[PDB]
Structure 1
Amino acid sequence: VVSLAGRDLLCLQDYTAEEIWTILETAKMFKIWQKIGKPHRLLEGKTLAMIFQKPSTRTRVSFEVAMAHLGGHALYLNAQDLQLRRGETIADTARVLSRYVDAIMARVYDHKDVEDLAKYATVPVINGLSDFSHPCQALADYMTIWEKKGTIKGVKVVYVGDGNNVAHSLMIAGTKLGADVVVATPEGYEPDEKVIKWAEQNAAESGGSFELLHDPVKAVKDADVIYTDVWASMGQEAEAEERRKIFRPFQVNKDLVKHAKPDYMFMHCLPAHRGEEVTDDVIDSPNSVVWDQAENRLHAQKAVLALVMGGIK
């Protein structure tokens, strides 16, 4: 294990497999503490400023509950209080905030904002969701796979659907952890080339693999976990619901799933659009693991805060 004291968590490609393992182990520990009822208020009086430039309840309550469990306090800054680059330069808000709080967690559209926030920060900055990546989710996801499957190594996890931020992060972490990851997406909707390049170099070292495809049924062959997420042009509606014809084939359903292992795990980072990317039969099939996966958002984030704030000096 290694110290992460004072670190930022913008993107996992900055992390070594050992650092990402440090967080999963501490998280497993905290999860057990919690199941047996053992208190662990390790951050009394510590404060975490959560800046939300676009709502997200799962992230807001998982970070807020995580801090409460550790005895600290998360303040919730909204878009009606905190636009970033509007009433003051991002550098200035970072400077002042770092005089009051102990760590910042930002949920922002433009990844460059969370990056600017970190550069002038002085206090650890965590990325709860940007358009480029979602690290906290990957940690929860691989934590889940690790719990259920017993290992992350030779597991074929395949993501089907639009290549977005969580897709990026599933690639970066799994490939760093040694998993054989494959992503299948409609032709013009594949992950950013930079992260694809990343995924391949990462893969060499962890004897994992990465593989882009454009045919779901091929991708999902003999899969251990099938993962999906909501799809493109979010806010599209009938007035550009085009995502339907193109993405529709990718919908995780009874038939697609049939190509995976009998004991495959279905994952989705929520929210689900039952009917689109996934059907009732799947999310609710006993192969579904969406809730344990949701829960691990609490444990995993509980570990990164303790690790990056607790290691004080």
Structure 2
Amino acid sequence: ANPLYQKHIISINDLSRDDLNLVLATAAKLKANPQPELLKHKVIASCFFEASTRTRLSFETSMHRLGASVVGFSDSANTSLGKKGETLADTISVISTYVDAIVMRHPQEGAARLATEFSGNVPVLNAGDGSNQHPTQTLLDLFTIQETQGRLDNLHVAMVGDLKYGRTVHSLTQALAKFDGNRFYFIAPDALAMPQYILDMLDEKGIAWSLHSSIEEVMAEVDILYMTRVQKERLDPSEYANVKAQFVLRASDLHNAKANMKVLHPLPRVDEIATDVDKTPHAWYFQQAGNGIFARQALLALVLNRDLVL
């Protein structure tokens, strides 16, 4: 079986550089040559306990492009967990007797890991667990960085905005740190800084990183400018000063930008990216969202189909 067959996909921290490349290599192939029936006779649960547009709809679209059926909910309010007091554990215990894989998003950190302890032989794919991990975001992100830079090694990467609560940048930083010679610029209000467990991990691998108070400092040297939304629904009331985007990228900020540089954003954006950026050749957040289809197809393929696709 391929290395990822029947595997839980919970945290980038559990995956190796080889696993990530495997996903990417499979994504390339299916994009070039769709296999509309690879997952025929699979039924897959799509269980979203907090809000989603991109992650849920692209996952479900991926399932249909590969021929799988889909069941689930986009809202927990009409599940028996929502109305009758049922635990998440019992919820996973019954659903795992129905389907071939469980895609789940949840507002509490650790939820995906928990489901893993009740799902038997049914793989769980983490579509995001509180402010912890978002591994499939990282997969599409890597695919996008690869697509536009030609490599994943020796890059200058700025991450801007809410780094404390961004499950996106927790996962992505851990992933890039598995590759050689990448450099990090972290642009956050002090209250929403990148957590210490990420920084320690970087120091352990001798990876270079530094803090900056503006985008303009690093604009000249960045290959990837990764903008994020302030995670207001995760914020403590004591952190309410940071609700407003502290850094707003506009088209004029891009004057000194390298021709190769792309602006990425896991979306949705509020105002951290002004609309005038949309038309500039650096804007790639929509192309990025679209790459979600290829990354998520690949992931489903590898988890549910024992043989390497080709």
For the aligned pair, the TM-score class normalised by the smaller chain equals: 0.7 to 0.9
SS at match of 2:125: strand
Listed as ranges, the matches of 1:236-275 within 5 Å are 242-243=241-242, 247-248=245-246, 250-273=247-270
Instruction: Tell me the equivalent position of 1:291.
Output: 286
Instruction: Tell me the equivalent position of 2:141.
Output: 141
Residues 1:211 and 2:210 aligned together: yes
Instruction: Tell me the equivalent position of 1:81.
Output: 78
Residues 138-167 of structure 1: CA deviation (Å, up to 9, x unaligned): 111110111121111111121111111112
Paired AA for residue 228 in structure 2: D
Residues 147-197 of structure 1: CA deviation (Å, up to 9, x unaligned): 121111111121111111112122111111333232211111112222332
Instruction: Tell me the equivalent position of 2:64.
Output: 68
Paired AA for residue 96 in structure 2: S
**Cα offset, 1:232, TM superposition:** 4.2
Gaps of 5+ in 1: none
**Cα offset, 1:83, TM superposition:** 6.8
SS at match of 1:100: coil
Instruction: Tell me the equivalent position of 2:222.
Output: 223
Instruction: Tell me the equivalent position of 2:123.
Output: 124
TM-aligned CA distance change 1:219 to 1:83, over 3 Å: farther
Instruction: Tell me the equivalent position of 1:309.
Output: 304
Cα distance in 2 for residues equivalent to 1:232 and 1:89: 26
Residues 45 and 101 of structure 2 are in contact (CA less than 8 Å); yes or no, is this contact kept in structure 1?
yes
**Identity, % of aligned pairs?**
28
Instruction: Tell me the equivalent position of 1:151.
Output: 151
Paired AA for residue 255 in structure 2: K
Cα distance in 2 for residues equivalent to 1:127 and 1:73: 19
Residues 80 and 86 of structure 2 are in contact (CA less than 8 Å); yes or no, is this contact kept in structure 1?
no
TM-aligned CA distance change 1:111 to 1:255, over 3 Å: same
**Cα offset, 1:31, TM superposition:** 1.1
**Cα offset, 1:286, TM superposition:** 1.7
SS at match of 1:99: coil
Listed as ranges, the matches of 1:32-181 within 5 Å are 32-34=32-34, 39-77=35-73, 78-82=75-79, 84=81, 87-122=85-120, 123-130=122-129, 131-163=131-163, 164-178=166-180, 179-181=182-184
TM-aligned CA distance change 1:181 to 1:291, over 3 Å: same
TM-aligned CA distance change 1:281 to 1:67, over 3 Å: same
**Cα offset, 1:258, TM superposition:** 3.4
Residues 216 and 253 of structure 2 are in contact (CA less than 8 Å); yes or no, is this contact kept in structure 1?
yes
Give the paired residue count. 297
Cα distance in 1 for residues equivalent to 2:125 and 2:202: 22
Residues 105-164 of structure 1: CA deviation (Å, up to 9, x unaligned): 111111222221111112111111222121111111110111121111111121111111
Cα distance in 2 for residues equivalent to 1:169 and 1:219: 22
TM-aligned CA distance change 1:189 to 1:258, over 3 Å: farther
TM-aligned CA distance change 1:2 to 1:155, over 3 Å: farther
Residues 36-90 of structure 1: CA deviation (Å, up to 9, x unaligned): xxx3411111111111111212112111111111111121223123375863232
SS at match of 2:257: coil
Gaps of 5+ in 2: none
**Cα offset, 1:281, TM superposition:** 2.0
Cα distance in 2 for residues equivalent to 1:171 and 1:104: 25
Cα distance in 2 for residues equivalent to 1:138 and 1:226: 15
Paired AA for residue 46 in structure 1: K
Residues 2 and 22 of structure 1 are in contact (CA less than 8 Å); yes or no, is this contact kept in structure 2?
no
SS at match of 2:93: helix
Q: TM-score when scaled to structure 2?
A: 0.87
TM-aligned CA distance change 1:233 to 1:94, over 3 Å: closer
Residues 104 and 125 of structure 1 are in contact (CA less than 8 Å); yes or no, is this contact kept in structure 2?
yes
Comparing 45-54 with 283-292, greater Cα deviation is found at 283-292
SS at match of 2:44: strand
**Cα offset, 1:244, TM superposition:** 6.2
SS at match of 1:226: strand
